Structure formats: structure tokens, C-alpha cells
Structure 1
Amino acid sequence: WALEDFEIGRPLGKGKFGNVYLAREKQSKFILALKVLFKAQLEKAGVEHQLRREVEIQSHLRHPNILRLYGYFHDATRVYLILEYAPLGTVYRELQKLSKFDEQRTATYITELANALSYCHSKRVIHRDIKPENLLLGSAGELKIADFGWSLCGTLDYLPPEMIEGRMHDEKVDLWSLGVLCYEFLVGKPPFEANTYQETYKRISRVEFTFPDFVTEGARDLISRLLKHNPSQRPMLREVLEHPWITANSS
């Protein structure tokens, strides 16, 4: 491709590294989104290596609930990412507007996500980023994950013990990362949010989390079944999809 192959639109967002204005291939008159990343930035931080990788990975990653990555090119100074356009914005935002999601929307979201993760695990790719910020919304309020470069302990809030503890972790993490989310969904905030980075592992690794006077108990267990110190003690994919909670409020 070529930067001339498309018509640029307003800036969808911002980025320390690069930008990403609305786009449109001039042929298809088709709407897009071009995540252009700078050089100097992909260079000011050994990440040229961190690129190509995900690049080649999403660059195949064909799933509804996985923001597709049509193509990529790159000129002297910069590089460009040609990707699926997600109109309804970020769940984070959606999540900061309605305070907390209901049960249909949050359970359903979780099952959407799960499968996106299934097709992932199958094709052996353990994501690791997922949280409101790296999850987008399509035409039908459908979900889309987008794990790439870009620009409140939120940093840790999401990580699983096995990692913040520097230990070894594998596939079993996407389940933990899947617990939190479902929680922050039904609540408004993560389950391990606390003032200091310190006062957090304390709650994360120690797995110190409480429920508000209302969350269904069917959650209270689907979740307690999604967050556990022991990575091998957690439900594999199926289970949630097959959990008494997903099914029912969902889809």
C-alpha cells in the first residue's frame, strides 16, 4: 500500500508513539483507521523488536471479537497500521459513562471476550493486555480486543500474581485477567484497586477482594472461580461460557 491510497479523517485518538486518524481507502470508499507509529519513538525504545511480532500475529488473527489488522506499510520516518474501525469507542469510556454495566451486557461481554480468547489459545497466542482500555466496540455494541503499542495503579490492577511476582505464567492468565474484568464490570472499579502499588500486590497476590451488597451470587462464584492464586486451579475456557451465569443473561 501507500499513504496516498487513503483519505485521512479526524484523529480518533492521540498517541505518544504515533496517531490514528479516521481513514478511507480511495478505491473502496471504505472506512478505516490508520494506527501510524513514529519512528524516533519505535526507536527511542527497543520496540522495533516488539513490533512485527504482534504485527504478524494480529495480521492473521481473524475473529469477530478481535479487531482485525487488514494491512501495514511504512515510509521513511513513520509506519502505518491499517485496521478494523470500531465506531462505538472504548468500553472503558462506555464503562465510565454508565458507572457499571448490568448483567446481560457484562456477562455477554465476558463470553464474547472469552471466545475471542478461545480462538486465540487454540492458535496458541496468549494475549495479556486486556482491560477496558484495550477493548473496543463495534456496530452492534459488540466487543473487539486491540493489543498493540500506543501511548491509578491501573498499571498493576490487572496483572495476575504469577507475573507481578515475576514468576512463570502461561495460558492460565487470560482467565485471571478475565476475572477482574467481569468484576470491574459489575462493580465500576477493579477488584484490586487501592491507593498504593504496594497496597495492591498485597491484595492481588494475597488475592484480597470483597463484594458489594448486590452483585448476584452467581457472579460471586463465577468470579471467585476466575481469580485464584494457583493458575492451574482456574477454569479453562469452556467452563465460563458454560457457567450458570454466562448462559441466561448473555447474547
Structure 2
Amino acid sequence: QWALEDFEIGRPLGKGKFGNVYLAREKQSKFILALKVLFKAQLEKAGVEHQLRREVEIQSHLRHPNILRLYGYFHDATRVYLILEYAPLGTVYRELQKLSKFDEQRTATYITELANALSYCHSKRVIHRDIKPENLLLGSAGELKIADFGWSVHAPSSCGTLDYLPPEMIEGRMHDEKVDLWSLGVLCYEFLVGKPPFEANTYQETYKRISRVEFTFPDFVTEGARDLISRLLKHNPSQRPMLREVLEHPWITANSSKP
């Protein structure tokens, strides 16, 4: 109930792992959307339909102002197309490259929007597992929008850089919704410092650093922030807080700018 000839394709938006996202317009409605294209050949040669069908199921059923809408799907000869909500202000990844690092206000606000969207996901027993600045998009009012549900799955459960992954995931162990709170602390740190707390020149060093929880705050990180990052970056996934605790944290409530 969809076809490529219903869309007027435009400019590339970003590059994915299995194909590019293009700015596009539905001819009949003049609707602006993003078309994520994936090549059947590459997903095959990797064996990830798997997730692609999981991404589509999970994403089409989520309705939240801080989660990216998936309007549909369709396919052809060698391509698989996803019709997504277009995020006009790009990624949190590009904004951090421009600004180098974010102020406590911008960070707390993004951490608030993340927690909201995450509560919603966890309330449907859905774990994102791929929370990275390359997957955090910005809508026309600068609001965060969680995207890329390729690696998401239902809680509990058992490719790229290891930076945002909790020790239980890197160690192949069993994992639940607490995985998304480790990511939230890695993001909070990265937003303030400009780099993730466990970055290394090798996948190998990063693994040691994550498993040991080897992180140090530079001087400009306030006690308020130090507290929450240390609270979320706990090796024991039971020792991590709930999103309700995050949303109510003094540093969060004090610096977050509510709507």
C-alpha cells in the first residue's frame, strides 16, 4: 500500500549502516518526510532482517513527542524503504561537533526529554539499547527525538563502538531496562565533556574501561552533575536509579527548562 513512485526524493539526510536516509515528499499530499533506504543484499550478507522487521514493529507502535514516528514501509527489487518523520534540525551528534560541549541547561533538558521517551518505551517493556548522539534527532522546536530502533528489543534479552553499552551487554550477560540508564549517564557525561566517559583508541581498551567503570570528571563538571553521572554509571544494574529518580534529580529539576 505504498510505492517509490508516490515520493519525490530530495537531498541525503545522513548515512546509515545498510543505506542512506533521504529527504522526500509524498506527491499527493505534499508531505515532508525522511525515507530510510536499506539494500536487501547488504542486510542479507549480514543476516539482520531479523531486527529490521523488529525495528518496524517496535517503531510503528510508539507514540510520544520525544520518539521519531514511523509512518510505514514498502520494498522493491533490491531496496527496503522506511517512511519516517523528518527531524529538520539534524542530530545531537552534529550539534555537539559545532558547540564542542553543552551547558547544564541544554544537557538537563535533553536528559529530561530522554527520560520521558525512555519511561514510555520501558512502560511497553521496550529497551532501546542503541542510545547514541548519532540516533538523537532534533525537531523544529529543538526537541529531542529518539530514532533508530534497529537494536531495540523486548525486556529481558541476551556491531559498532562499545562506548554507550553497559558492562552486562559487552560481557554478553543478561539485560533489561537498566541498560538504557547506563546510556543516559554516558550521554549526560558526553554532553558536558564533549567526549564519552570510556572513549579509547581501541575497542579493546574501551571494553576494559567499561567493565571496570574507569571514568574521571574534568574540573568544570559541577557536583550536581558528578552525582547523577556516578549514580547512573553503576556496574551493578540493580544499583542504577529509575527514570523517575532521574527526572526528579535536583541538578535535573534545577537546570531543565520545562515546556
Pairwise TM-score range, normalised by the shorter structure: over 0.9
Q: Give distance in 1, aligned partners of 2:243 and 2:70.
A: 25
Change (3 A) 1:154 1:224: farther
Q: For 1:91-115, what per-residue CA distance to the aligned partner results, in whole angstroms no more than 9, with x for missing partners? A: 1110111010001100110110111
2:49 partner SS: coil
Q: Does 1:174 align with 2:180?
A: yes
* Count of matched residue positions in the alignment of Structure 1 and Structure 2: 251
Query: Is the contact between residue 73 and residue 83 of structure 2 (CA under 8 Å) also seen in structure 1?
Result: yes
Query: Is the contact between residue 18 and residue 36 of structure 1 (CA under 8 Å) also seen in structure 2?
Result: yes
Q: How many percent of aligned residue pairs carry the same amino acid?
A: 100
Structure 1: stretches of 5+ with no match in the other structure: none
- Aligned-residue offset at 1:205: 1.2
Equivalent in the alignment of 2:84:
83
TM-score, normalising length from structure 2? 0.92
For the aligned residue pairs, the C-alpha RMSD in angstroms reads 2.5
Deviates more, 1:14-23 or 1:46-55: 14-23
Q: Give distance in 2, aligned partners of 1:234 and 1:151.
A: 20
- Aligned-residue offset at 1:15: 4.0
- Aligned-residue offset at 1:19: 2.3
Q: Give distance in 2, aligned partners of 1:57 and 1:151.
A: 8
- Aligned-residue offset at 1:194: 2.2
- Aligned-residue offset at 1:155: 0.3
Change (3 A) 1:106 1:154: farther
Query: Is the contact between residue 54 and residue 150 of structure 2 (CA under 8 Å) also seen in structure 1?
Result: no
Query: Is the contact between residue 58 and residue 149 of structure 2 (CA under 8 Å) also seen in structure 1?
Result: no
Query: Is the contact between residue 183 and residue 223 of structure 1 (CA under 8 Å) also seen in structure 2?
Result: yes
Structure 2: stretches of 5+ with no match in the other structure: 154-158
Q: Give distance in 1, aligned partners of 2:17 and 2:186.
A: 27
- Aligned-residue offset at 1:17: 2.0
Q: Give distance in 2, aligned partners of 1:132 and 1:170.
A: 21
Q: Give distance in 1, aligned partners of 2:116 and 2:134.
A: 19
Q: Give distance in 1, aligned partners of 2:205 and 2:27.
A: 52
Query: Is the contact between residue 51 and residue 151 of structure 2 (CA under 8 Å) also seen in structure 1?
Result: no
Deviates more, 1:75-84 or 1:184-193: 75-84
Change (3 A) 1:148 1:41: farther
- Aligned-residue offset at 1:36: 1.4
Q: Give distance in 2, aligned partners of 1:16 and 1:243.
A: 36
2:81 partner SS: strand
Change (3 A) 1:250 1:72: same
2:82 partner SS: strand
TM-score, normalising length from structure 1? 0.95
Query: Is the contact between residue 227 and residue 234 of structure 1 (CA under 8 Å) also seen in structure 2?
Result: yes
Query: Is the contact between residue 15 and residue 151 of structure 1 (CA under 8 Å) also seen in structure 2?
Result: no
Q: Give distance in 1, aligned partners of 2:14 and 2:216.
A: 35
- Aligned-residue offset at 1:151: 17
- Aligned-residue offset at 1:144: 1.0
Q: Give distance in 2, aligned partners of 1:223 and 1:113.
A: 14
Change (3 A) 1:16 1:119: closer
Larger fraction in strand:
2
